[PDB]
Amino acid sequence: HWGYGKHNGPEHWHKDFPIAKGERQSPVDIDTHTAKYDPSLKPLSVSYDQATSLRILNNGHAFNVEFDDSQDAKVLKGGPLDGTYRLIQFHFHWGSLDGQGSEHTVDKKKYAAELHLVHWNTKYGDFGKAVQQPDGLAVLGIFLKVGSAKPGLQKVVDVLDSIKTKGKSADFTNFDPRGLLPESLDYWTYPGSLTTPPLLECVTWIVLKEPISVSSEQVLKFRKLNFNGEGEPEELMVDNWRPAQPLKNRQIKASF
Ligand SMILES: CN1CCN(NC(=S)Nc2ccc(S(N)(=O)=O)cc2)CC1
Numbered sequence: 606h607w608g609y610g611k612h613n614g615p616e617h618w619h620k621d622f623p624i625a626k627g628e629r630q631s632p633v634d635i636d637t638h639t640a641k642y643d644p645s646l647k648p649l650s651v652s653y654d655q656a657t658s659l660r661i662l663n664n665g666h667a668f669n670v671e672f673d674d675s676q677d678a679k680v681l682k683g684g685p686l687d688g689t690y691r692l693i694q695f696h697f698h699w700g701s702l703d704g705q706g707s708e709h710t711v712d713k714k715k716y717a718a719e720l721h722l723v724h725w726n727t728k729y730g731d732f733g734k735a736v737q738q739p740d741g742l743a744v745l746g747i748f749l750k751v752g753s754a755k756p757g758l759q760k761v762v763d764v765l766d767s768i769k770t771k772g773k774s775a776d777f778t779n780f781d782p783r784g785l786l787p788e789s790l791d792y793w794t795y796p797g798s799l800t801t802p803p804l805l806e807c808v809t810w811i812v813l814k815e816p817i818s819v820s821s822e823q824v825l826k827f828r829k830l831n832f833n834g835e836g837e838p839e840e841l842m843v844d845n846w847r848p849a850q851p852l853k854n855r856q857i858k859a860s861f
């Protein structure tokens with residue numbers, strides 16, 4: 606029954622998921638002065654023109670926008686990656702206040718939220734097989750700061766009303782994730798894990814340096830969601846982020 610509360614929060618996860626104290630856990634603080642430019646990095650390729658979203662789901666921890674990954678279309682390639690990774694879902698982590706909410710930090714700076722675009726390595730054939738491989742997943746992480754609105758986000762926030770509580774879902778077709786991307790594809794990369802149980806160490810992290818801006822009004826709508834199911838006492842879905850974990854035997858590489 607893991608969550609983000611006092612009694613079932615990140616400091617508790619290791620009891621059911623001992624890999625919480627592993628060698629390549631996420632997220633991490635990104636120390637910009639220690640990160641090193643890596644010339645071996647190839648150009649990053651974010652090809653989302655043919656993406657087909659299907660649904661949005663409140664899963665009791667976040668909301669996921671799910672994509673039809675039955676065929677190759679929305680893919681991530683290049684950068685640190687070998688091969689082709691298919692987009693399967695995106696979600697956010699966000700805070701109770703604008704000064705916290707991201708998982709990754711940049712010289713210990715917390716952003717108001719963090720977008721995760723989750724992709725799996727098609728050479729393993731299905732997502733389930735991919736999450737048993739050390740190079741199974743690639744997650745493209747994008748910070749959110751509060752300022753001007755992000756027009757490409759508004760459709761997301763406009764449907765949240767209909768998936769307030771855990772287990773609720775709504776149709777969510779024809780959403781274009783290209784509208785969530787910043788101008789620059791400059792990134793940091795390192796090997797890590799899922800940031801929620803079961804914390805599997807299968808992820809290549811690609812974290813963009815340029816945040817996107819969203820409005821106070823847009824993030825306020827995220828904070829009106831519920832962790833709980835329908836009819837249950839309200840627990841606002843806020844602070845669903847895991848803090849920075851030990852870097853251990855890793856180096857963060859910069860694309861720039
Ligand atoms: C048990 N089962 C394992 C598979 N899981 N599916 C997904 S897509 N999990 C997932 C969890 C966290 C991240 S994050 N936050 O690292 O991007 C990205 C993906 C669902 C639950």
Ligand SMILES: [Zn+2]
Pocket residue numbers: 696697698721800
């Ligand atoms: Zn995430």
